[PDB]
């Protein structure tokens, strides 16, 4: 499970960069899913059903692999249909250079409301502009949200 995380992080993404990632809050510069190759993925990949779910590395057939995404056949099967009868609304992850990627559609970034985002362990790293956000309970499915 844990070694299904893609560790394809660039050298430029060092601990100093990660320290100042959720440290930038004291701010003028703020705001179709398929097969994603694991070579361009740094960190866990999250999809939202609207509840957050981790999608680990697999081969192209969908069989899970456990080699830190180091293999060149490792991908993330993120194909999605709307989650009343499908799997998830969309997904979010950080790529090798440190940019947050999205795909699919938000559950209503992964925004429930125009001001509230689904809360998940990597929210503060993937979306630093939401560090001053407050956490509220949501029942849509019992999950937590982060709002202004």
């Amino acid at each position, epitope marked *: 499970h*844990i*070694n299904s*995380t893609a*560790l*394809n*992080c*660039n*050298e430029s*993404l*060092n*601990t*100093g*960069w*990660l*320290a100042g990632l959720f440290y930038q809050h004291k701010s003028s510069g703020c705001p179709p899913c398929g097969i994603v190759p694991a070579k361009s993925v*740094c*960190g866990p990949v999250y999809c939202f059903t609207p509840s957050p779910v981790v999608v680990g590395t697999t081969d192209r057939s969908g069989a899970p692999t456990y080699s*830190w995404g*180091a293999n060149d056949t490792d991908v993330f099967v993120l194909n999605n249909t709307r989650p009343p009868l499908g799997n998830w609304f969309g997904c979010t992850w950080m790529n090798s250079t440190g940019f947050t990627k999205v795909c699919g559609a938000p559950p209503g970034g992964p925004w429930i409301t125009p001001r509230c985002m689904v809360d998940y362990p990597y929210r503060l790293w993937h979306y630093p502009c939401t560090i001053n956000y407050t956490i509220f309970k949501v029942r849509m499915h019992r999950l937590e949200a982060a709002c202004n």
Partner: antibody
Amino acid sequence: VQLVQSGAEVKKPGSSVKVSCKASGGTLSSYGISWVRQAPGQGLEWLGGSIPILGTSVYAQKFQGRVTMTADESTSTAHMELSSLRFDDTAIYYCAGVREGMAAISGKNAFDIWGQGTMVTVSS
Amino acid sequence: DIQMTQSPSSLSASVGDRVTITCRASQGISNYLAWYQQKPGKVPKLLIYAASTLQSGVPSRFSGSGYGTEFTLTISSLQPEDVATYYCQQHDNLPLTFGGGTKVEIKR
């Protein structure tokens, strides 16, 4: 600037040893602390290591069922615990890292700062 | 596991000789290879990073080269203070793995 390790010990086979690694004047999390051991007159062997993007440490499968690595930011001290010690575990244990916050968040690091080393001797 | 094969086991040379240490890899590791020097009784020092990037405060006589599977650490003018075991470590894949090491001694 310096990583200071605990003192040499002798432990009986099947027991446990805990080794500390104190980073003077620095945030322990920025160094990407790994543990590398060296048997007497032999090569270097990488046990576990810290992975910032996961916020925890992962271990080589050779030690997965009997090594745990902790880090206390409030005391700038990292620990390595090795359980069920066998005679083959007699070595000098180094904590290692890279300075100035240049540690790759992937954990795939070359280390330019090393502790002084701690010899653990498994014997009765 | 990436495996590092480093040659030779032991090496003897004279002050002022070129010394070449080779390190082969079981998979392509791009240029993600480091070299350490470890003088007896001391901790390893990082000399070369990312195959050819020399570390700060390292004599210009040490250099690295290579891309893919085979890498070489070369010491243009061997000096008395250069006697120690030299090790290569790959930093492209987990687990991080080291070479056997090459013991460098001096004929005088």
